[PDB]
PDB file of C-alpha atoms and ligand atoms in Angstrom:
ATOM      1  CA  UNK U   1      17.811 -29.238   6.112  1.00 38.51           C
ATOM      2  CA  UNK U   2      15.662 -32.209   7.113  1.00 36.79           C
ATOM      3  CA  UNK U   3      17.115 -35.693   7.435  1.00 41.53           C
ATOM      4  CA  UNK U   4      17.051 -38.715   9.708  1.00 38.51           C
ATOM      5  CA  UNK U   5      19.450 -37.682  12.495  1.00 37.99           C
ATOM      6  CA  UNK U   6      18.686 -36.699  16.085  1.00 37.56           C
ATOM      7  CA  UNK U   7      18.903 -33.023  15.155  1.00 38.93           C
ATOM      8  CA  UNK U   8      16.967 -33.056  11.856  1.00 34.69           C
ATOM      9  CA  UNK U   9      14.926 -36.272  11.967  1.00 32.80           C
ATOM     10  CA  UNK U  10      11.205 -37.158  12.030  1.00 30.00           C
ATOM     11  CA  UNK U  11      10.608 -35.435  15.407  1.00 32.95           C
ATOM     12  CA  UNK U  12      11.742 -32.125  13.904  1.00 33.43           C
ATOM     13  CA  UNK U  13       9.979 -32.215  10.539  1.00 33.67           C
ATOM     14  CA  UNK U  14       6.769 -30.538  11.730  1.00 32.00           C
ATOM     15  CA  UNK U  15       8.559 -27.206  12.212  1.00 30.53           C
ATOM     16  CA  UNK U  16       9.226 -26.749   8.476  1.00 27.15           C
ATOM     17  CA  UNK U  17       6.345 -29.019   7.407  1.00 25.57           C
ATOM     18  CA  UNK U  18       3.361 -28.584   9.767  1.00 23.57           C
ATOM     19  CA  UNK U  19       1.367 -31.183   7.788  1.00 22.81           C
ATOM     20  CA  UNK U  20       3.599 -33.689   9.645  1.00 17.89           C
ATOM     21  CA  UNK U  21       0.881 -33.577  12.324  1.00 16.08           C
ATOM     22  CA  UNK U  22      -1.948 -33.826   9.779  1.00 14.92           C
ATOM     23  CA  UNK U  23      -4.958 -36.097   9.464  1.00 19.15           C
ATOM     24  CA  UNK U  24      -3.627 -38.605   6.922  1.00 20.10           C
ATOM     25  CA  UNK U  25       0.077 -39.078   7.615  1.00 22.69           C
ATOM     26  CA  UNK U  26       2.160 -42.100   6.682  1.00 24.81           C
ATOM     27  CA  UNK U  27       3.455 -44.610   7.518  1.00 25.55           C
ATOM     28  CA  UNK U  28       1.104 -46.374   9.927  1.00 26.64           C
ATOM     29  CA  UNK U  29       0.960 -49.606  11.842  1.00 28.73           C
ATOM     30  CA  UNK U  30      -1.225 -52.127  10.060  1.00 29.74           C
ATOM     31  CA  UNK U  31      -3.257 -53.907  12.712  1.00 31.26           C
ATOM     32  CA  UNK U  32      -4.133 -57.070  10.774  1.00 31.29           C
ATOM     33  CA  UNK U  33      -7.054 -58.026  12.977  1.00 29.92           C
ATOM     34  CA  UNK U  34      -8.708 -54.588  12.624  1.00 27.28           C
ATOM     35  CA  UNK U  35      -8.158 -54.227   8.863  1.00 27.41           C
ATOM     36  CA  UNK U  36     -11.411 -55.191   7.190  1.00 25.31           C
ATOM     37  CA  UNK U  37     -11.653 -57.392   4.159  1.00 27.28           C
ATOM     38  CA  UNK U  38     -13.310 -55.361   1.429  1.00 26.60           C
ATOM     39  CA  UNK U  39     -14.905 -57.665  -1.188  1.00 24.11           C
ATOM     40  CA  UNK U  40     -15.376 -54.605  -3.434  1.00 26.13           C
ATOM     41  CA  UNK U  41     -11.576 -54.226  -3.776  1.00 29.39           C
ATOM     42  CA  UNK U  42     -10.236 -55.342  -7.148  1.00 30.28           C
ATOM     43  CA  UNK U  43      -7.076 -57.322  -7.836  1.00 30.01           C
ATOM     44  CA  UNK U  44      -4.068 -55.055  -8.309  1.00 32.01           C
ATOM     45  CA  UNK U  45      -2.988 -54.569 -11.936  1.00 32.68           C
ATOM     46  CA  UNK U  46       0.778 -54.163 -12.106  1.00 33.53           C
ATOM     47  CA  UNK U  47       1.878 -53.734 -15.716  1.00 34.87           C
ATOM     48  CA  UNK U  48       5.641 -53.324 -15.776  1.00 36.46           C
ATOM     49  CA  UNK U  49       6.423 -55.223 -19.018  1.00 38.31           C
ATOM     50  CA  UNK U  50       7.321 -52.005 -20.880  1.00 40.11           C
ATOM     51  CA  UNK U  51       9.108 -50.300 -17.963  1.00 40.27           C
ATOM     52  CA  UNK U  52      12.024 -48.118 -19.044  1.00 41.03           C
ATOM     53  CA  UNK U  53      14.489 -47.511 -16.230  1.00 41.81           C
ATOM     54  CA  UNK U  54      16.962 -44.704 -16.817  1.00 41.64           C
ATOM     55  CA  UNK U  55      19.159 -43.797 -13.880  1.00 40.35           C
ATOM     56  CA  UNK U  56      19.936 -44.427 -10.229  1.00 39.92           C
ATOM     57  CA  UNK U  57      20.518 -41.459  -7.918  1.00 41.05           C
ATOM     58  CA  UNK U  58      21.756 -41.065  -4.364  1.00 43.07           C
ATOM     59  CA  UNK U  59      19.647 -38.114  -3.224  1.00 41.65           C
ATOM     60  CA  UNK U  60      21.152 -37.890   0.278  1.00 42.41           C
ATOM     61  CA  UNK U  61      18.151 -39.666   1.836  1.00 40.98           C
ATOM     62  CA  UNK U  62      17.951 -42.936  -0.095  1.00 41.72           C
ATOM     63  CA  UNK U  63      18.619 -43.952  -3.693  1.00 38.71           C
ATOM     64  CA  UNK U  64      16.036 -43.598  -6.466  1.00 39.03           C
ATOM     65  CA  UNK U  65      15.802 -45.828  -9.516  1.00 40.58           C
ATOM     66  CA  UNK U  66      14.171 -43.534 -12.060  1.00 39.47           C
ATOM     67  CA  UNK U  67      11.889 -44.411 -14.944  1.00 36.41           C
ATOM     68  CA  UNK U  68      10.711 -42.814 -18.150  1.00 33.39           C
ATOM     69  CA  UNK U  69       7.229 -41.618 -17.208  1.00 34.49           C
ATOM     70  CA  UNK U  70       6.527 -39.629 -20.396  1.00 35.76           C
ATOM     71  CA  UNK U  71       4.372 -42.472 -21.786  1.00 37.15           C
ATOM     72  CA  UNK U  72       2.179 -45.246 -20.347  1.00 37.34           C
ATOM     73  CA  UNK U  73       5.042 -47.759 -20.010  1.00 37.97           C
ATOM     74  CA  UNK U  74       4.914 -49.043 -16.429  1.00 38.95           C
ATOM     75  CA  UNK U  75       1.508 -48.539 -14.841  1.00 36.74           C
ATOM     76  CA  UNK U  76      -0.434 -49.424 -11.735  1.00 36.59           C
ATOM     77  CA  UNK U  77      -4.228 -49.708 -11.938  1.00 39.57           C
ATOM     78  CA  UNK U  78      -7.080 -51.571 -10.269  1.00 40.24           C
ATOM     79  CA  UNK U  79      -7.216 -52.407  -6.590  1.00 38.63           C
ATOM     80  CA  UNK U  80      -8.476 -49.340  -4.754  1.00 36.47           C
ATOM     81  CA  UNK U  81      -7.537 -47.065  -7.659  1.00 36.46           C
ATOM     82  CA  UNK U  82      -9.641 -45.206 -10.176  1.00 32.52           C
ATOM     83  CA  UNK U  83      -7.703 -44.577 -13.393  1.00 31.35           C
ATOM     84  CA  UNK U  84      -4.058 -45.079 -14.312  1.00 32.78           C
ATOM     85  CA  UNK U  85      -0.894 -44.388 -12.330  1.00 34.58           C
ATOM     86  CA  UNK U  86       2.543 -44.199 -13.957  1.00 37.01           C
ATOM     87  CA  UNK U  87       5.718 -45.479 -12.338  1.00 36.84           C
ATOM     88  CA  UNK U  88       8.205 -42.642 -11.840  1.00 37.24           C
ATOM     89  CA  UNK U  89      10.730 -44.100  -9.381  1.00 36.56           C
ATOM     90  CA  UNK U  90      11.365 -46.656  -6.715  1.00 36.01           C
ATOM     91  CA  UNK U  91      13.481 -46.435  -3.587  1.00 36.76           C
ATOM     92  CA  UNK U  92      13.889 -48.179  -0.245  1.00 32.64           C
ATOM     93  CA  UNK U  93      13.973 -47.383   3.461  1.00 29.33           C
ATOM     94  CA  UNK U  94      16.173 -49.544   5.671  1.00 28.11           C
ATOM     95  CA  UNK U  95      17.726 -49.943   9.075  1.00 28.00           C
ATOM     96  CA  UNK U  96      21.105 -50.139  10.723  1.00 29.00           C
ATOM     97  CA  UNK U  97      20.052 -53.590  12.043  1.00 26.07           C
ATOM     98  CA  UNK U  98      17.913 -56.359  10.522  1.00 23.17           C
ATOM     99  CA  UNK U  99      15.223 -55.772  13.192  1.00 25.67           C
ATOM    100  CA  UNK U 100      14.272 -52.305  11.942  1.00 27.99           C
ATOM    101  CA  UNK U 101      14.023 -50.338   8.730  1.00 28.49           C
ATOM    102  CA  UNK U 102      10.471 -50.565   7.439  1.00 29.01           C
ATOM    103  CA  UNK U 103       8.162 -47.578   7.620  1.00 25.36           C
ATOM    104  CA  UNK U 104       4.902 -49.466   7.760  1.00 25.79           C
ATOM    105  CA  UNK U 105       4.673 -52.091  10.465  1.00 27.02           C
ATOM    106  CA  UNK U 106       2.398 -55.125  10.701  1.00 21.29           C
ATOM    107  CA  UNK U 107       0.995 -55.736  14.181  1.00 18.04           C
ATOM    108  CA  UNK U 108       3.971 -53.638  15.328  1.00 17.02           C
ATOM    109  CA  UNK U 109       6.452 -55.885  13.466  1.00 13.02           C
ATOM    110  CA  UNK U 110       9.289 -53.993  11.778  1.00 12.33           C
ATOM    111  CA  UNK U 111      10.826 -55.458   8.658  1.00 12.34           C
ATOM    112  CA  UNK U 112      14.477 -54.959   7.652  1.00 12.58           C
ATOM    113  CA  UNK U 113      13.506 -52.650   4.791  1.00 15.28           C
ATOM    114  CA  UNK U 114      10.622 -51.416   2.680  1.00 14.60           C
ATOM    115  CA  UNK U 115      10.467 -50.845  -1.074  1.00 11.46           C
ATOM    116  CA  UNK U 116       8.333 -48.000  -2.418  1.00 13.67           C
ATOM    117  CA  UNK U 117       7.292 -48.013  -6.064  1.00 15.95           C
ATOM    118  CA  UNK U 118       5.994 -44.497  -6.648  1.00 14.54           C
ATOM    119  CA  UNK U 119       3.306 -43.835  -9.260  1.00 14.56           C
ATOM    120  CA  UNK U 120       1.417 -40.686 -10.261  1.00 13.85           C
ATOM    121  CA  UNK U 121      -2.140 -40.306 -11.505  1.00 16.43           C
ATOM    122  CA  UNK U 122      -2.076 -39.595 -15.236  1.00 14.15           C
ATOM    123  CA  UNK U 123      -5.178 -37.404 -14.993  1.00  9.98           C
ATOM    124  CA  UNK U 124      -2.961 -34.698 -13.444  1.00 12.90           C
ATOM    125  CA  UNK U 125      -0.456 -34.688 -16.298  1.00 15.75           C
ATOM    126  CA  UNK U 126       2.787 -34.568 -14.287  1.00 13.94           C
ATOM    127  CA  UNK U 127       4.166 -35.639 -10.924  1.00  9.99           C
ATOM    128  CA  UNK U 128       4.456 -32.068  -9.601  1.00  7.63           C
ATOM    129  CA  UNK U 129       0.759 -31.467 -10.211  1.00 10.01           C
ATOM    130  CA  UNK U 130      -0.204 -34.915  -8.898  1.00  9.41           C
ATOM    131  CA  UNK U 131       1.343 -34.376  -5.441  1.00  9.04           C
ATOM    132  CA  UNK U 132      -1.033 -31.442  -4.945  1.00  9.46           C
ATOM    133  CA  UNK U 133      -4.060 -33.756  -5.178  1.00 11.47           C
ATOM    134  CA  UNK U 134      -5.559 -36.136  -2.577  1.00 10.50           C
ATOM    135  CA  UNK U 135      -5.555 -38.941  -5.177  1.00 11.00           C
ATOM    136  CA  UNK U 136      -2.357 -37.843  -6.932  1.00 10.81           C
ATOM    137  CA  UNK U 137      -0.069 -40.773  -6.091  1.00 10.97           C
ATOM    138  CA  UNK U 138      -0.224 -44.494  -5.556  1.00 14.95           C
ATOM    139  CA  UNK U 139       2.716 -45.996  -3.726  1.00 15.05           C
ATOM    140  CA  UNK U 140       3.153 -49.740  -3.775  1.00 16.24           C
ATOM    141  CA  UNK U 141       4.955 -50.781  -0.602  1.00 16.61           C
ATOM    142  CA  UNK U 142       6.745 -54.097  -0.279  1.00 17.65           C
ATOM    143  CA  UNK U 143       8.421 -55.386   2.863  1.00 14.73           C
ATOM    144  CA  UNK U 144      11.908 -56.888   2.840  1.00 14.16           C
ATOM    145  CA  UNK U 145      12.998 -59.586   5.257  1.00 13.78           C
ATOM    146  CA  UNK U 146      16.504 -61.000   5.526  1.00 13.88           C
ATOM    147  CA  UNK U 147      16.870 -64.600   4.333  1.00 12.54           C
ATOM    148  CA  UNK U 148      17.534 -65.838   0.821  1.00 12.28           C
ATOM    149  CA  UNK U 149      18.833 -63.378  -1.777  1.00 13.78           C
ATOM    150  CA  UNK U 150      16.453 -61.650  -4.167  1.00 11.57           C
ATOM    151  CA  UNK U 151      18.064 -62.288  -7.566  1.00 11.68           C
ATOM    152  CA  UNK U 152      16.166 -59.375  -9.152  1.00 10.11           C
ATOM    153  CA  UNK U 153      17.677 -56.992  -6.605  1.00 14.92           C
ATOM    154  CA  UNK U 154      21.314 -57.817  -7.350  1.00 13.20           C
ATOM    155  CA  UNK U 155      21.727 -55.364 -10.260  1.00 13.17           C
ATOM    156  CA  UNK U 156      20.691 -52.578  -7.875  1.00 11.52           C
ATOM    157  CA  UNK U 157      23.052 -53.816  -5.147  1.00 10.98           C
ATOM    158  CA  UNK U 158      26.019 -53.982  -7.511  1.00  9.27           C
ATOM    159  CA  UNK U 159      25.698 -50.399  -8.752  1.00  9.19           C
ATOM    160  CA  UNK U 160      25.631 -48.870  -5.241  1.00  8.57           C
ATOM    161  CA  UNK U 161      29.439 -48.535  -5.036  1.00 10.52           C
ATOM    162  CA  UNK U 162      29.207 -46.071  -7.930  1.00 10.28           C
ATOM    163  CA  UNK U 163      26.650 -43.824  -6.177  1.00  8.30           C
ATOM    164  CA  UNK U 164      28.081 -43.924  -2.664  1.00  6.65           C
ATOM    165  CA  UNK U 165      27.559 -40.268  -1.827  1.00  9.08           C
ATOM    166  CA  UNK U 166      24.823 -37.647  -2.076  1.00  9.89           C
ATOM    167  CA  UNK U 167      24.345 -36.286  -5.584  1.00  9.26           C
ATOM    168  CA  UNK U 168      26.018 -39.164  -7.421  1.00  5.75           C
ATOM    169  CA  UNK U 169      24.072 -40.879 -10.194  1.00  4.33           C
ATOM    170  CA  UNK U 170      24.715 -43.675 -12.673  1.00  2.94           C
ATOM    171  CA  UNK U 171      23.096 -44.984 -15.850  1.00  2.00           C
ATOM    172  CA  UNK U 172      20.605 -47.695 -14.873  1.00  2.00           C
ATOM    173  CA  UNK U 173      18.866 -48.729 -18.049  1.00  2.00           C
ATOM    174  CA  UNK U 174      17.095 -52.013 -18.737  1.00  2.00           C
ATOM    175  CA  UNK U 175      16.232 -52.803 -15.152  1.00  2.00           C
ATOM    176  CA  UNK U 176      13.076 -54.870 -14.781  1.00  2.00           C
ATOM    177  CA  UNK U 177      11.170 -53.985 -11.576  1.00  3.11           C
ATOM    178  CA  UNK U 178       9.056 -57.149 -11.955  1.00  6.70           C
ATOM    179  CA  UNK U 179      12.025 -58.904 -10.334  1.00  5.94           C
ATOM    180  CA  UNK U 180      11.310 -57.098  -7.034  1.00  3.86           C
ATOM    181  CA  UNK U 181       7.744 -58.325  -6.575  1.00  7.44           C
ATOM    182  CA  UNK U 182       6.596 -61.193  -4.330  1.00  8.44           C
ATOM    183  CA  UNK U 183       4.315 -63.968  -5.665  1.00  6.10           C
ATOM    184  CA  UNK U 184       1.088 -62.657  -4.180  1.00  7.75           C
ATOM    185  CA  UNK U 185      -0.467 -59.272  -4.854  1.00  5.82           C
ATOM    186  CA  UNK U 186      -2.688 -59.467  -1.741  1.00  3.38           C
ATOM    187  CA  UNK U 187      -2.606 -56.038  -0.129  1.00  3.99           C
ATOM    188  CA  UNK U 188      -3.747 -53.570   2.479  1.00  6.31           C
ATOM    189  CA  UNK U 189      -4.742 -50.060   1.447  1.00  3.00           C
ATOM    190  CA  UNK U 190      -5.392 -46.739   3.160  1.00  3.18           C
ATOM    191  CA  UNK U 191      -5.195 -43.001   2.359  1.00  6.79           C
ATOM    192  CA  UNK U 192      -1.952 -41.387   3.462  1.00  3.00           C
ATOM    193  CA  UNK U 193       0.983 -39.182   2.676  1.00  5.44           C
ATOM    194  CA  UNK U 194       4.538 -38.996   1.497  1.00  3.98           C
ATOM    195  CA  UNK U 195       6.717 -40.368   4.300  1.00  2.00           C
ATOM    196  CA  UNK U 196       9.352 -37.664   3.839  1.00  2.00           C
ATOM    197  CA  UNK U 197       9.074 -33.900   3.566  1.00  2.00           C
ATOM    198  CA  UNK U 198       7.088 -32.313   2.018  1.00  2.00           C
ATOM    199  CA  UNK U 199       4.790 -34.966   3.647  1.00  2.00           C
ATOM    200  CA  UNK U 200       1.981 -34.141   1.237  1.00  2.00           C
ATOM    201  CA  UNK U 201      -1.303 -35.943   1.786  1.00  2.00           C
ATOM    202  CA  UNK U 202      -1.583 -37.204  -1.757  1.00  2.00           C
ATOM    203  CA  UNK U 203      -0.965 -40.955  -1.564  1.00  2.00           C
ATOM    204  CA  UNK U 204      -3.151 -44.004  -1.859  1.00  2.00           C
ATOM    205  CA  UNK U 205      -0.994 -46.570  -0.073  1.00  2.00           C
ATOM    206  CA  UNK U 206      -1.048 -50.150  -1.290  1.00  2.00           C
ATOM    207  CA  UNK U 207       1.073 -52.355   0.963  1.00  2.00           C
ATOM    208  CA  UNK U 208       1.637 -55.967  -0.082  1.00  2.00           C
ATOM    209  CA  UNK U 209       1.091 -58.638   2.543  1.00  2.00           C
ATOM    210  CA  UNK U 210       3.860 -60.926   1.267  1.00  2.00           C
ATOM    211  CA  UNK U 211       7.399 -59.705   1.972  1.00  2.00           C
ATOM    212  CA  UNK U 212      10.271 -60.380  -0.375  1.00  2.00           C
ATOM    213  CA  UNK U 213      13.413 -62.067   0.958  1.00  2.00           C
ATOM    214  CA  UNK U 214      16.790 -60.406   0.468  1.00  2.00           C
ATOM    215  CA  UNK U 215      20.131 -61.676   1.709  1.00  2.00           C
ATOM    216  CA  UNK U 216      22.104 -60.227   4.605  1.00  2.00           C
ATOM    217  CA  UNK U 217      24.799 -59.331   2.048  1.00  2.00           C
ATOM    218  CA  UNK U 218      22.328 -57.391  -0.090  1.00  3.15           C
ATOM    219  CA  UNK U 219      21.093 -55.248   2.812  1.00  2.00           C
ATOM    220  CA  UNK U 220      24.664 -54.879   4.125  1.00  4.45           C
ATOM    221  CA  UNK U 221      25.469 -53.144   0.845  1.00  4.55           C
ATOM    222  CA  UNK U 222      22.528 -50.734   1.266  1.00  4.78           C
ATOM    223  CA  UNK U 223      24.117 -49.825   4.611  1.00  3.39           C
ATOM    224  CA  UNK U 224      27.443 -48.894   2.945  1.00  3.50           C
ATOM    225  CA  UNK U 225      25.822 -45.935   1.202  1.00  3.61           C
ATOM    226  CA  UNK U 226      26.396 -42.435   2.545  1.00  5.17           C
ATOM    227  CA  UNK U 227      24.034 -39.594   3.460  1.00  4.95           C
ATOM    228  CA  UNK U 228      26.943 -37.169   2.989  1.00  2.36           C
ATOM    229  CA  UNK U 229      28.427 -35.789  -0.203  1.00  3.94           C
ATOM    230  CA  UNK U 230      31.877 -36.711  -1.495  1.00  5.00           C
ATOM    231  CA  UNK U 231      34.723 -35.142   0.499  1.00  5.11           C
ATOM    232  CA  UNK U 232      32.552 -34.808   3.597  1.00  2.00           C
ATOM    233  CA  UNK U 233      32.833 -36.893   6.793  1.00  4.00           C
ATOM    234  CA  UNK U 234      31.172 -40.270   6.317  1.00  2.44           C
ATOM    235  CA  UNK U 235      27.618 -40.693   7.598  1.00  2.00           C
ATOM    236  CA  UNK U 236      26.325 -44.150   6.790  1.00  2.45           C
ATOM    237  CA  UNK U 237      22.948 -44.162   5.072  1.00  4.77           C
ATOM    238  CA  UNK U 238      21.008 -46.246   7.592  1.00  5.93           C
ATOM    239  CA  UNK U 239      17.743 -45.792   9.498  1.00  5.98           C
ATOM    240  CA  UNK U 240      16.197 -43.650   6.797  1.00  3.58           C
ATOM    241  CA  UNK U 241      12.655 -44.505   7.912  1.00  5.92           C
ATOM    242  CA  UNK U 242       9.855 -42.510   9.493  1.00  2.00           C
ATOM    243  CA  UNK U 243       8.090 -44.202  12.448  1.00  2.00           C
ATOM    244  CA  UNK U 244       4.409 -45.147  12.373  1.00  2.00           C
ATOM    245  CA  UNK U 245       2.087 -42.145  12.667  1.00  2.00           C
ATOM    246  CA  UNK U 246      -1.375 -41.834  14.256  1.00  2.00           C
ATOM    247  CA  UNK U 247      -4.074 -43.591  12.221  1.00  2.00           C
ATOM    248  CA  UNK U 248      -6.639 -40.955  13.259  1.00  2.00           C
ATOM    249  CA  UNK U 249      -9.879 -41.103  11.260  1.00  2.00           C
ATOM    250  CA  UNK U 250      -8.839 -43.817   8.804  1.00  2.00           C
ATOM    251  CA  UNK U 251      -9.670 -47.398   7.951  1.00  2.00           C
ATOM    252  CA  UNK U 252      -7.184 -49.856   6.511  1.00  2.00           C
ATOM    253  CA  UNK U 253      -8.804 -52.253   4.048  1.00  2.00           C
ATOM    254  CA  UNK U 254      -7.603 -55.731   3.117  1.00  2.00           C
ATOM    255  CA  UNK U 255      -7.941 -57.194  -0.376  1.00  2.00           C
ATOM    256  CA  UNK U 256      -7.914 -60.704   1.072  1.00  2.00           C
TER     257      UNK U 256
HETATM  258  C1  J43 G 301      12.946 -37.591  -0.363  1.00  2.00           C
HETATM  259  S1  J43 G 301      13.165 -35.939  -1.072  1.00  2.00           S
HETATM  260  C2  J43 G 301      11.670 -35.435  -1.890  1.00  2.00           C
HETATM  261  N1  J43 G 301      11.419 -34.161  -2.158  1.00  2.00           N
HETATM  262  C3  J43 G 301      10.288 -33.812  -2.775  1.00  2.00           C
HETATM  263 CL1  J43 G 301      10.024 -32.137  -3.084  1.00  2.00          CL
HETATM  264  C4  J43 G 301       9.346 -34.770  -3.163  1.00  2.00           C
HETATM  265  C5  J43 G 301       8.086 -34.389  -3.853  1.00  2.00           C
HETATM  266  O1  J43 G 301       7.131 -35.144  -4.018  1.00  2.00           O
HETATM  267  C6  J43 G 301       9.637 -36.091  -2.829  1.00  2.00           C
HETATM  268  N2  J43 G 301       8.871 -37.234  -3.184  1.00  2.00           N
HETATM  269  C7  J43 G 301       8.595 -38.339  -2.445  1.00  2.00           C
HETATM  270  C8  J43 G 301       7.942 -39.358  -3.119  1.00  2.00           C
HETATM  271  C9  J43 G 301       7.582 -40.519  -2.446  1.00  2.00           C
HETATM  272  C10 J43 G 301       7.876 -40.653  -1.087  1.00  2.00           C
HETATM  273  S2  J43 G 301       7.428 -42.066  -0.240  1.00  2.00           S
HETATM  274  N3  J43 G 301       8.669 -42.457   0.871  1.00  2.00           N
HETATM  275  O2  J43 G 301       6.191 -41.682   0.505  1.00  2.00           O
HETATM  276  O3  J43 G 301       7.259 -43.160  -1.252  1.00  2.00           O
HETATM  277  C11 J43 G 301       8.529 -39.618  -0.410  1.00  2.00           C
HETATM  278  C12 J43 G 301       8.894 -38.464  -1.090  1.00  2.00           C
HETATM  279  N4  J43 G 301      10.799 -36.369  -2.238  1.00  2.00           N
HETATM  280 ZN1   ZN G 302       9.517 -44.124   0.553  1.00  2.00          ZN
END
């Protein structure tokens, strides 16, 4: 199966998932000087006040914090988007070292990690249907740099010991994802894809300009997770990021 190792990593994915070499793959490098300010772009509407988190799962690639998406509870609208997108899960990508881990890069700069808040377009009724549509998903990407701790991240960090290995889950109710946002909602946006198999070209990417700061201890604890299942040799869950892909025939737009 696909993963992040030398034998099953990003360079291999195209064999099972030929769309890996497609026309709108993610992530990409964001060249800040080439991104054009689009005055037609609206402010981003992030409405997470009624978010209902349920569970946290180690899926063998990262960990997902899952939400109740059976009602309009936590929704993303505005910005480049037409309509309403429901929050289904968030997860992170991170490195073995503070100098790598993000999927998107900014003028080739790699951040220590990247948070993805995954939302699906309600006009398609469910997530499975949404991923089959060019405008099916909106993923809000937020960079993490190492510095001061992010207090709103600590509840996530502290539960990781209970989901160390692939397939483990834990109850994760009453988590407020508003605590993971930076101050500014200034963003870049472009049409792209899922950054893991199946690599479907169904995502409007919205990447925030302002990173959040997390502590070295917080990211250290991400790095204690395992790709492997319980009772299997330990493979630390690190470097679970896909490199920047060719921009091809795309423009990145800036809201600012
Ligand atoms: C990771 S296993 C996996 N498998 C399947 Cl079958 C799907 C189906 O959609 C999926 N979703 C997914 C959602 C968001 C992102 S990202 N990194 O672009 O935000 C990547 C994968 N992930
Ligand atoms: Zn992701």
